[PDB]
Enzyme design. Sequence first.
Site, mmCIF file in Angstrom:
data_model
loop_
_atom_site.group_PDB
_atom_site.id
_atom_site.type_symbol
_atom_site.label_atom_id
_atom_site.label_comp_id
_atom_site.label_asym_id
_atom_site.label_seq_id
_atom_site.Cartn_x
_atom_site.Cartn_y
_atom_site.Cartn_z
ATOM 1 N N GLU A 164 2.862 1.908 3.665
ATOM 2 C CA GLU A 164 1.963 1.920 4.813
ATOM 3 C C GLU A 164 1.561 0.517 5.246
ATOM 4 O OE1 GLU A 164 -1.236 4.461 3.486
ATOM 5 O OE2 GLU A 164 -0.273 6.250 4.318
ATOM 6 N N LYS B 207 -7.515 -3.675 3.845
ATOM 7 C CA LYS B 207 -6.379 -2.851 4.244
ATOM 8 C C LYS B 207 -5.665 -3.480 5.433
ATOM 9 N N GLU C 296 -0.911 4.739 -8.286
ATOM 10 C CA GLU C 296 -0.640 5.496 -7.068
ATOM 11 C C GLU C 296 0.583 6.367 -7.323
ATOM 12 O OE1 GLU C 296 -2.486 5.471 -4.334
ATOM 13 O OE2 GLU C 296 -1.237 6.696 -3.007
ATOM 14 N N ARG D 295 -3.606 8.687 -5.268
ATOM 15 C CA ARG D 295 -4.169 7.846 -6.315
ATOM 16 C C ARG D 295 -4.459 8.691 -7.549
ATOM 17 N NH1 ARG D 295 -8.279 3.072 -7.131
ATOM 18 N NH2 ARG D 295 -7.817 2.271 -5.036
ATOM 19 N N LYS E 202 0.867 -1.177 0.000
ATOM 20 C CA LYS E 202 0.000 0.000 0.000
ATOM 21 C C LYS E 202 0.904 1.227 0.000
#
Length: 631
Positions: A451, A475, A352, A304, A299
């Site tokens: 992350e 997530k 991203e 984005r 991540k």
Amino acid sequence: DPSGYNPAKNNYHPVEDACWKPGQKVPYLAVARTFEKIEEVSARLRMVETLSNLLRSVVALSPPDLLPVLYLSLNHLGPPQQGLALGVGDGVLLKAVAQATGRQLESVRAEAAEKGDVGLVAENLPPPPLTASGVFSKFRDIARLTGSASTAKKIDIIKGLFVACRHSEARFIARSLSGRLRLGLAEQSVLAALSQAVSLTPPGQEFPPAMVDAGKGKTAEARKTWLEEQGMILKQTFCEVPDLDRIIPVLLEHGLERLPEHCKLSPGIPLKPMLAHPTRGISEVLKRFEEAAFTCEYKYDGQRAQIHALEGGEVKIFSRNQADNTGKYPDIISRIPKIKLPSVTSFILDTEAVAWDREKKQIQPFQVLTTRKRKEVDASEIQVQVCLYAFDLIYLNGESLVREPLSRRRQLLRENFVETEGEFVFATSLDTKDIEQIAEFLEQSVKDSCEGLMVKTLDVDATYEIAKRSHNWLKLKKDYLGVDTLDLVVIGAYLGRGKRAGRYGGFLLASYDEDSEELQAICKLGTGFSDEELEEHHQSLKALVLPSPRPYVRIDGAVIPDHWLDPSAVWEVKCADLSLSPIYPAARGLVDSDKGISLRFPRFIRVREDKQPEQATTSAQVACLYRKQSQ
DNA sequence: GCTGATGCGTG
DNA sequence: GTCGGAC
DNA sequence: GTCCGACCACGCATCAGC
């Protein structure tokens, strides 16, 4: 009389129970009376029916007023890619109210602070009545005002609205301009009310409309499944074309049934992106995705970017909220040919954007990406380089890939696109179900300045369909695990707004500077506590109210707490990262010469009754926590 | 022309 | 973004 | 589970007052 309009009556007749004549403009007080009935109830099912009753009267009597009513209900000004914004805040609004009541700005500012709602102060010779489309045109007129003296021009329009306000019209116009309608009904319920309205009362009927309530000749079970099936058609099409300026025209003419055949995904329009849901750990990932093949990807901490390239070479970049970011990234528009193969004539990427150091060849924190100019047409003046990282493909060569599984979209992306290292690369991935492998991937993610890990299914429920499930992605961040916490002291409170009027909404935390014997403000805290804990906080910290701050408290430019609290409460706060703060004094001079350290995504956990203000997280510990991160 | 205050928009 | 509440 | 609205830090861009 529009004052008695009640769109929440049983057996609501769209024509008789209205408050304006057919062909006449929809009065704003009709919309205001509808908002009142919506905020007086708490069930969304009741809100949706109340709004749909107004929508049925609009579509049956005043068709052209449908878009303004929907945009007024959504508290929006138009499509997201347009970029219209009011530019009106609390100060401008309060100043425009004060000119309508002749009261000093301090009296109006004190009323909204204690009430938590500016709309109440506004509501507390007669011009013609306000119309729905007319009020919406004034909102758009305010948003277009730019340049010098534009604020004074905005205040005159706002003053002009409040003069022609009747009953609750002043409360809702003030809330709308404040950007805080507090309606309890948003985009999901608006679409549900719209689909229910045009299905009960179909559009395009010659007046008097022949049909008004199609749930008449059907059992409640059939009516329920019929409304939900029709609502799903509107959902998915709006998730592909979130643009009411293009959906409502087609819907008002071709019907909701044939809507998908026209409002279709094409390169150039921004679609709603896929979101993610938080998981407490790998055990929750294997439990939710049980008997399901999933892939793990880093991540990335950045922005984005949704890259559209139409058939013809025109490239457009949109954010996750359908905001046009073409001029922000001219470095990407030149990079387009170096990524696509010759067989790629039209596509839509899901990337991203992250800050990239061209010399050290490494990733840079999110704070360096935010230093990028947003209207920087100068492609040569770009200082912060950006490296793309594609992780999904929605469109390819005139074909829509939404109904395809993630494993198919992965194979199409990894084949028709080339990794120009340092500029474009496929997101780091690993397909496995071993707990030891997924643990090393998540740890390597934080080691590679990320992350955490994204968990997406490969085949089962692996479609890019938002209307089905909007959070099918999972997530897995490090702060979710456990695995940081900071023990800080409270030094002041803030008055609450909206659902927090009359209670404490925000709190000001502080660390301890051992070498200076002073408490340094570190961040604010406004989430993580329940309403029962909030009452305990407002009761425990009640007897600790101070008229003036203590001489050993240093807040610097932080918002002066409305209630200075005696330093005697220690709380455990969790954050995602330690940020270099241009506003807080915590640990200033210890890492940066003139910048303190704040917390990213702070949250409350528990009140440390065992610890005392001296036994709190030191600024030296805060400085070590920040340095221990992988900058 | 500058600057502090602030609105907006992310995440 | 993170979070709880009401349904 | 969904939907909504409380709340957070922080960057650029904008503009009134000087």
